[PDB]
Structure formats: structure tokens, C-alpha cells
Ligand binder design. Structure first.
Ligand code: HEM
Length: 414
């Protein structure tokens, strides 16, 4: 169930055009907003390209996020497709039976009970604290790049480490454990790492999270994970806390890192937009929202399953169907954004779907916005005459993974 064994290539392959929609998404423009999608495993799903239709999927009681109970077409092993199509593939476990912390695969009220504990740690006071910590880590990384020379690969020097170290801050990873943590999270994202090298790094992090939760139970500090372990009422089990720590790491690192690298890339390819930002630093917050709309690193990973038949976007979707949001095309819906394929950091700011919608809308979105606002402000103000040192078409793209991004971003400054 690797993404490229499931999603048709033309819906995700950018070739050497990172900012342009893949041709299979382009070819659905001006058609019904919801259309069938034939998956490479032979299973059927439905694809949503409409903004209003995507909002409905993500905030309608007939579309379930419980992808444990409701099997998705995108999850099917080859031996399971004919059972799925025949309606004889069993559901996963009923949520009443589950003891795990994977609240991402739950609907209200089971979702709500765990999501409330996490919102409870993402307080406005913690967010103010994290903005200061983001500022420190960003400036330290940029000052390190400038001390080492006049050129850098922005991905390992800046885009990967800042969000990884912010996860370390949330989880209360001790200073002496950070280098190893950073190494293991980087392996996950390395083009050159084998499936065996990855599965070892993944097992090392799972065991690390178990040890980290046990350590916060014994020796709590001021971090979000200490808060979940000690201050949560009602209390989570150790197993649930491990699951929540793995969810935060999974959700908060790769996305933010890829957004930092691709945002720097887009600004260097759109010097007029970079000029607007250097000229008026107050534009940074609106610019981050435009970059989130324009780049949409989530790709086709946002899906739900119908629990009853639904008519939407010109489609009669049956019960039990997988509905995939084409988040990059939803964020280019010309009903919402005139001239949607233009990067315009001065655009009037209106809601996009880069962080999803409804009860599961990104828990980390304020923190992600802080990382982008601070990161890009510090990069643009500290690195004069920042430039790519390879042509844009030679920057290597990550379009075989669930999250889109660049593998390298070679830059220089003066
Ligand atoms: C630019 C960076 C990011 C993007 C684009 C992003 C995008 C998303 C999206 C689209 C979802 C909704 C998925 C769905 O409904 O199926 C989501 C959920 C979530 N994200 Fe973010 N994310 C980012 C950063 C972060 C960060 C920094 C954290 C935490 C530190 C975080 C934690 C979460 C969590 C825990 C969920 C699950 C929420 C739930 O199911 O209730 N994310 N993210």
C-alpha cells in the first residue's frame, strides 16, 4: 500500500514542474467537483477537487475519519480488492473496543475526548513560549549556515532540523538525546535510505517513545508530553500516550520541514513576491497563508469513508466509499481564488484547506504557522541576495512519498 502502488502517477508526479498541478488533476478542471478515481490496486474511490465539496466531506456526519473501522480503498492489499468490491471485506475493530491513542482514526465523541486533552496542552501561553523557541532555533541555524560559508543545502541545514527540534520541545526530549532523535527522524525522509534502514530508524523511535513516556511518568517537566502524562483528566494509559507522541511526530515534522523547503524554493522562483516581503515585513503572515494555499504539501492523503449514500459534486457516492480530497486542486478552486495558479502574497486572505477542516483540522496549525512566519522572516532578512545554485528543474522532488517536498535545496547568499 505504498502511495505509488495505489494513487495513479499522473495525480502526484510533477516531473520537473514542482509548483504546477500534475496533469491528471489539471485534466479534471471544469468537470464535476467529485468524480470516480480508479486506484492502481483495482479498487474504486472518489476524488474531490471542489472547495465547497471538500469542506462538506471534512465536516459532515456521513463521512467518517475512522479508517480503522471503515477500510479505505487506498489501504487494500492485492488479495483484499475483490472482497472490498464484493462488500465482503470485514470492518476493522469497533471504536468502543479500542484502547489505542490513534484519535486521528476516530469520530466524535471518541475523537473529542482525546482531542480535548491535546487542545488543552496547545494553550495560547504555550504557543507564545513556542514562538520564542522557534525564533531561537531558526536564528541559531541561520547563524550556523553563515559561519560555515556562503552556500548551504537548506534542507539538512534548516528545513529538517527546525521542526524536528520543535517536536523535541513538545515531547520534552532531553538535550543529550536530541542529536540521535534528529538523526532517526532525518533517516525517515532521506531519498537514499533503504526500506531496511528506515524500518530500523522507525523501530528505534517507537522504543524511544516508550522510554520517553516512562521517563515523563517518573520525572515530569514543563513539556506537552509531561502535561498529557500528569495533568490529563481523565488520564491516558502509557500505551495511549505513546500512540499520541507518535501521532505528533508523524504529523508535525515531515509536513513543516517540506513546507519550509518548498516555500523558500517558491520565493526564489518568484522574486517579485520575495521583494514584496522584504519591503513590508508585516506581509509575512498573509504570505504564509498564500504559500500554504499555493504549495499544498498534503497531496492526496486526506480521505474519509461514507457511512451512507451521499450525492455531492455531481456524484452519487455509495455507502462504504473512499472519498479522497485533492487538496492541491481544492486550494486552486477558481470559485474561491481568481487566478488561482498565481502565487500572490498580497491576495486577500481567505480560508484554504492546507490544514484540513472540521473536527480533525490540524491540531498544530498555529505552531506550523509560527514555524513558517518566523523561519521565512529570519531566512529572508539574514541571507542577502539568497539564490538557488542549481536550476529549478534540477531540484530533486519528493513525489513518491505521502507529503510533497524537495530532497535538496542548494542556495547561496552574499
Ligand atoms: C505545514 C505544516 C502542516 C500541515 C500542512 C499539516 C496538515 C494537516 C492536515 C491536512 C491535517 C488533517 C488531516 C485529516 O483530517 O485527515 C492535520 C492533522 C493534524 N496535524 Fe497537522 N499539519 C502541519 C503541521 C503540524 C504540526 C506542526 C503539528 C504538531 C506539532 C501537527 C499535528 C497534527 C495533528 C495531531 C493532527 C491530527 C488532528 C486530528 O485528527 O484531530 N501538524 N495536519
Amino acid at each position: 500500500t505504498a502511495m505509488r502502488r495505489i494513487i495513479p502517477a499522473d495525480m502526484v508526479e510533477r516531473s520537473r514542474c514542482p509548483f504546477d498541478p500534475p496533469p491528471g488533476l489539471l485534466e479534471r478542471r471544469g468537470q464535476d467537483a467529485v468524480q470516480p478515481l480508479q486506484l492502481l490496486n483495482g479498487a474504486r474511490a472518489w476524488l474531490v477537487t471542489g472547495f465547497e465539496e471538500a469542506r462538506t466531506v471534512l465536516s459532515d456526519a456521513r463521512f467518517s475519519a475512522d479508517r480503522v473501522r471503515h477500510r479505505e480503498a487506498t489501504s487494500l492489499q492485492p488479495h483484499e480488492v475483490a472482497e472490498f468490491e464484493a462488500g465482503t471485506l470485514p470492518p476493522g475493530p469497533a471504536v468502543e473496543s479500542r484502547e489505542d491513542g490513534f484519535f486521528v482514526f476516530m469520530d466524535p465523541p471518541e475523537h473529542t475526548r482525546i482531542r480535548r486533552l491535546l487542545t488543552g496542552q496547545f494553550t495560547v501561553r504555550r504557543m507564545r513560549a513556542l514562538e520564542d523557541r522557534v525564533t531561537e532555533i531558526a536564528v541559531e541555524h541561520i547563524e550556523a549556515m553563515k559561519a560555515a560559508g556562503t552556500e548551504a543545502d537548506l534542507v539538512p541545514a534548516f528545513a529538517l532540523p527546525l521542526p524536528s527540534l520543535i517536536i523535541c520541545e513538545l515531547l520534552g526530549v532531553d538535550y543529550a538525546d536530541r542529536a540521535e532523535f534528529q538523526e532517526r527522524t532525518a533517516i525517515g525522509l532521506n531519498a537514499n535510505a533503504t526500506a531496511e534502514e528506515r524500518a530500523v530508524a522507525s523501530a528505534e523511535l517507537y522504543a524511544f517513545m516508550q522510554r520517553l513516556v516512562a521517563d515523563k511518568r517518573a520525572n515530569p517537566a514543563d513539556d506537552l508530553l509531561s502535561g498529557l502524562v500528569h495533568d490529563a483528566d481523565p488520564p491516558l494509559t502509557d500505551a495511549q500516550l505513546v500512540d499520541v507522541a507518535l501521532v505528533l511526530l508523524g504529523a508535525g515534522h515531515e509536513t513543516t520541514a517540506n513546507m519550509l523547503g518548498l516555500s523558500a524554493f517558491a520565493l526564489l522562483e518568484n522574486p517579485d513576491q520575495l521583494a514584496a516581503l522584504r519591503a513590508d515585513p508585516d506581509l509575512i503572515d498573509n504570505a504564509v497563508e498564500e504559500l500554504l494555499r499555493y504549495l499544498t504539501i498534503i497531496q492526496l492523503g486526506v480521505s474519509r469513508v461514507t457511512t451512507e449514500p451521499v450525492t455531492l459534486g455531481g456524484a452519487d457516492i455509495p455507502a462504504g466509499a473512499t472519498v479522497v480530497i485533492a487538496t492541491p486542486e481544492v486550494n486552486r478552486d477558481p470559485q474561491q481564488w481568481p487566478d488561482p495558479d498565481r502565487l500572490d502574497v498580497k491576495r486577500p486572505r481567505t480560508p484554504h484547506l492546507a490544514f484540513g477542516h472540521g473536527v480533525h483540522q490540524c491540531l498544530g496549525q498555529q505552531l506550523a504557522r509560527i514555524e513558517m512566519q518566523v523561519g521565512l522572516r529570519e531566512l529572508i532578512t539574514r541571507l542577502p541576495d539568497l539564490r538557488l545554485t542549481v536550476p529549478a528543474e534540477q531540484v530533486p522532488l519528493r513525489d513518491e512519498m505521502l507529503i510533497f517536498g524537495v530532497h535538496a535545496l542548494p542556495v547561496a547568499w552574499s
